[PDB]
Amino acid sequence: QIVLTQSPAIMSASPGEKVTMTCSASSSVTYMYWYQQKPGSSPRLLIYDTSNLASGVPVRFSGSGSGTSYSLTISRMEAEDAATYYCQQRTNYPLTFGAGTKLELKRADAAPTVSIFPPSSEQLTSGGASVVCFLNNFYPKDINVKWKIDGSERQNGVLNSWTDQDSKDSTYSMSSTLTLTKDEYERHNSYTCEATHKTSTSPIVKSFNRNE
């Protein structure tokens, strides 16, 4: 019945430095358990009974704490450690997990690359028109999209999907797609997708015209 809060929610650390992750319990807890989950894979046990390590766990992970405050410490951050980490408790059945500390790998500031695509003739045949705007290779994850039709902003019918952090260059990529009807698409001419990133206040602008 105990509620476990893991802090912070999103971690950003560079390879080769000390990493301290913390979990906090509502009331007194006897033993703590930690779990690692890499993207697209089953979770695994790292630490059992507050401090002891599981078999197969590399010598860099450490755990400590008591009562309400507990910590998982990584002495030296490695590339294969970029994963989500979870709190785990008992002596209160349930038997609950934490929110999940997402350990993300640090990268030097990256600027997004934008490519806007007009709706295909195959879709315009069916009666639908989806304008796809690709936002590729940027750091960090947080970014804002703004669809502008003839200057006026559009909010409904927008689809936004992000990718997980890349294993090679450690950058994020997202796909922005606005869905419209054949009638709604042909009424207007200019279509713009704007990217508002932390790297620059000036929006990265890619646009096209329908009549052309």
Partner: protein
């Protein structure tokens, strides 16, 4: 050694029931506790219950009664979990888990993704995405392949039958009223396109579809 195999995905309409299994090997099944965990997109891990086959002990999470009924077959070999109710709330990844006594887990199963939806199995579409009329800025050209309106997951998207893989960003699908929408981008130099052939290939096992779409210049 210790392996907990469980089926890929189950797709069942609201109201009806599902029987999940977990083929356990690498250890003595009747010795260690078997636990079950539910994981949702952005809500975290939720523990359901656990069975000891010994000594038959069946624990449950109070929030999961009586949505889940846990039983164990011992011959053969597996641990069973029946979900009775089935609602849109139930749509999640369900994990098998081994543990030595209450209440922590050593090894986790492959995980079965359960999708509770009234939607029917449907074939994909596949559309070619070509750059602006004229030329692309710089030296690197960007191409795309849009797959709209398909159920269920997944779809295998490969460029040039498997000859093109470098600089490819495949974006995860999103639910849009019963049918999924997936997109993928590829970045190559201007000396390769449109001098050489580039084709996006999409296959859907649930509908037996094989589409090869060539990106023609506008």
């Amino acid at each position: 050694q210790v392996q907990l195999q469980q089926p890929g995905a189950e797709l069942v309409r609201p109201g009806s029931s599902v029987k999940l299994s977990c083929k356990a090997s690498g250890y003595t099944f009747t010795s260690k506790w078997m636990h079950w965990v539910k994981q949702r997109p952005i809500q975290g891990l939720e523990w359901i219950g656990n069975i000891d086959p010994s000594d038959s002990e069946t624990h449950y999470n109070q929030k999961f009664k009586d949505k889940a009924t846990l039983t164990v077959d011992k011959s053969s070999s597996t641990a069973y979990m029946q979900l009775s109710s089935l609602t849109s709330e139930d749509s999640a990844v369900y994990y098998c888990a081994r543990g030595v006594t209450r209440g922590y887990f050593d090894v986790w199963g492959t995980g079965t993704t359960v999708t509770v939806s009234s939607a029917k199995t449907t074939a994909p579409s596949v559309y070619p995405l070509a750059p602006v009329c004229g030329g692309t800025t710089g030296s690197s050209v960007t191409l795309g392949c849009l797959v709209k309106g398909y159920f269920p997951e997944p779809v295998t998207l490969t460029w040039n039958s498997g000859s093109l893989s470098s600089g490819v960003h495949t974006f995860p699908a999103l639910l849009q009223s019963g049918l999924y929408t997936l997109s993928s981008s590829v970045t190559v130099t201007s000396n390769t396109w449109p001098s050489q052939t580039i084709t996006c290939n999409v296959a859907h096992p649930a509908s037996s579809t094989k589409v090869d779409k060539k990106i023609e210049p506008r």
